Design a binder for this molecule. Sequence first.
Ligand SMILES: O=C(O)c1ccccc1O
Ligand SMILES: O=C(O)c1ccccc1O
Lengths: 140, 145
Amino acid sequence: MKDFEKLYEATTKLVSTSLKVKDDLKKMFKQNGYDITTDHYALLRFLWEQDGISQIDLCEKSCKDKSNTTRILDVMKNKGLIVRKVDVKDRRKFQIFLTDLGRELEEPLNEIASIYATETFKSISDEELPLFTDILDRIG
Amino acid sequence: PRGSHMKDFEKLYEATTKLVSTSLKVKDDLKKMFKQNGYDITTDHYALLRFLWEQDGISQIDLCEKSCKDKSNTTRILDVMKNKGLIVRKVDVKDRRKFQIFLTDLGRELEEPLNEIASIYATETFKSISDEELPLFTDILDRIG
Ligand SMILES: O=C(O)c1ccccc1O
Ligand SMILES: O=C(O)c1ccccc1O
């Protein structure tokens, strides 16, 4: 039926497809001169939707945890993509803002990611997307 | 690139996210599965042993290709697996540079009790997914890329 061999394959494919996809996309960013990771692009996506999100919300949005998200954010700050501000209401609590460089990169990075998305999913039909997704949702 | 039937980018992005967040939630779930249960063994240790139990005495080339992955990391974990006393290297009787990987005694004894655990975790992991869905999932994932 769905014996251990298949479940182990499934799990294995899921993890490796995920890794390949992150890594191919990062390579395509680098090929075009953008030295960013997939993690940076995801976080930037949140920020292009809503500037000045608190650190705290952003770690909840992240699909990652606080220690890993915070490290990733330091790198981005170091790359000049965002700044960190002492809050207008509080202290020990920051807001995360786009720099101009961070805003400038919406168009170009989203374009590269589109190109990468269309090719990577060319063999999949539109209608398979919610099936795939609803399976992933019910795993674990 | 293009076509007369394009998918919406946002949908592909959301699905890519779901793929990735789910892979992570799954690795998290499985992190301590041997350790909480009395075997000081990682996930990576385990996935390599699966290849070894299937093909004991495989070439470190074919293994690094089996693993897909980064050779130093594949190799680096191999190293802990030597140190823990799970595997060792004998040198391939073809070249003087090509290696071969072989399970230690623990390595072979560990098959049953570690597969037993992983089976029970896998079953749990996929318990709300149906029999027909499994090869569908799997076929989608193969076609991605
Ligand atoms: O990747 C693993 O080590 C694993 C563990 C338990 C069940 C399925 C799996 O692929
Ligand atoms: O969840 C992620 O880190 C991610 C990975 C690849 C593409 C888009 C993403 O949001």
